[PDB]
Amino acid sequence: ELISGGWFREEPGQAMSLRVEKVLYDAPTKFQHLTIFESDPKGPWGTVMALDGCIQVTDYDEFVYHEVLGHTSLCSHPKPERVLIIGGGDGGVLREVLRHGTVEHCDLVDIDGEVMEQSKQHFPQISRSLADPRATVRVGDGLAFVRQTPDNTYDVVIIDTTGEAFYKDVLRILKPDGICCNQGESIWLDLELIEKMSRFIRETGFASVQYALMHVPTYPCGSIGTLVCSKKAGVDVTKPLRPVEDMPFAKDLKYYDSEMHKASFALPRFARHINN
């Protein structure tokens, strides 16, 4: 029950407010509250999607997190043929993955079928990937999906979502050269959580884990990062194995390139122990 002309508010002791031009969807789903609106056309954001009160997608900045997740992982892999995306119901990470000609197939599993339906309706430049015949899009819980996946199925697993048994399944379903990249977390709000997850994922049996920081302006404090995790040892994910500049789509990307890839693993000194 957002109203056109009203203001959408996101909140300890800080709030962000964006004026609403047209409400497109606002209702609880089976799993979470989903809000989609056209923002004030006098500002840059365009259409906005929020999940339980928190902006997840906007027209203006959607490309950052999708390009970074899709390319930092696939450009770290020698031949990414088969890819899994867990979450990603909006289609953005999938759109990026499908740019890569080496990809033969990509499975995507998101628990909330209404997010994909609403992204098809109101974010066609993000969600058009979901109709690709190289993609199999499924509605289900990713926890159960990886539990039921055979050993050695995927070259790359991306976890684009909003436990010890889960990560051991991710490690087991990846092939020997496997690369995983995981949910965004903030060096400003979540530093302790990042340092724990990084230790835990190495302990689980990944050979290396490096955090890649990116400039997402609509995420709280304006950055987020992903842990890029290599199953095999001797792999340096911080310098691209397969530079995107050698691929025919590089000029179409709005954020990512090789210079940003190498830059993203440089952290502010207070966080640098995450990576060394």
Place this chain on the structure above:
Amino acid sequence: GWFREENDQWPGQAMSLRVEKVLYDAPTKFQHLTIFESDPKGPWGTVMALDGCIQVTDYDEFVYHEVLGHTSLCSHPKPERVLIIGGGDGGVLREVLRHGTVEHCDLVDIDGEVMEQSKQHFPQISRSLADPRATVRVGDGLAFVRQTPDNTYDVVIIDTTAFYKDVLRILKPDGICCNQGESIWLDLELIEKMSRFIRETGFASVQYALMHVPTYPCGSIGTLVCSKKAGVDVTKPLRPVEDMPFAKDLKYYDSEMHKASFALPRFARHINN
């Protein structure tokens, strides 16, 4: 009990912080100055705004002060005399003073009430103001540079809320000017203009360095790093901070972050080529 930030140039958008206690709120001869204690449940601590725009918080002031102070002084072969225009809070100056090469720093800020309030409410920032190697002037930086001799400064840092020709003129041959330089998300066209304008004034190279500033609108800002002498690749450090004894005291800046900060998203990269 909320401070609300919203600027006419970015319509239908706002950021707000809960106010625990108001410390100061008055116009000044030049601008509106607001200082408050923010919610103790949150990280920001004490907050200073000027004309309704947050300029400093206890929590993240290190980022903008380290980037400005160290990107510029680490890009200079031997920075002995430094000018700061603005910076009445003391933060750039505190960073500039870490450097053993610096013999003297002049700091010229138009607003004396800023410095006064900063000594009162931000002592861990404004202690620098009392340093024997600094001279602090209340006054317009536009007038100050006009009345400064050619070839006076190694580094000019413009930390603010004909002029550039004067900055170019007062810098020695190998001089570096660094200026606060706007958001790639909300003012990218202003950065393009400024970059071209400074280059045509006669700086030989101008490069934009991006940094993560969590209390700034959309979480980032950058500075334009400008060299009078050509061939000067500012984007790699000439005096790496790691060879200096205060390197581990820093909370944000090091040489990996220096190099990284000049890598721009593809949509903004035409600022640097």
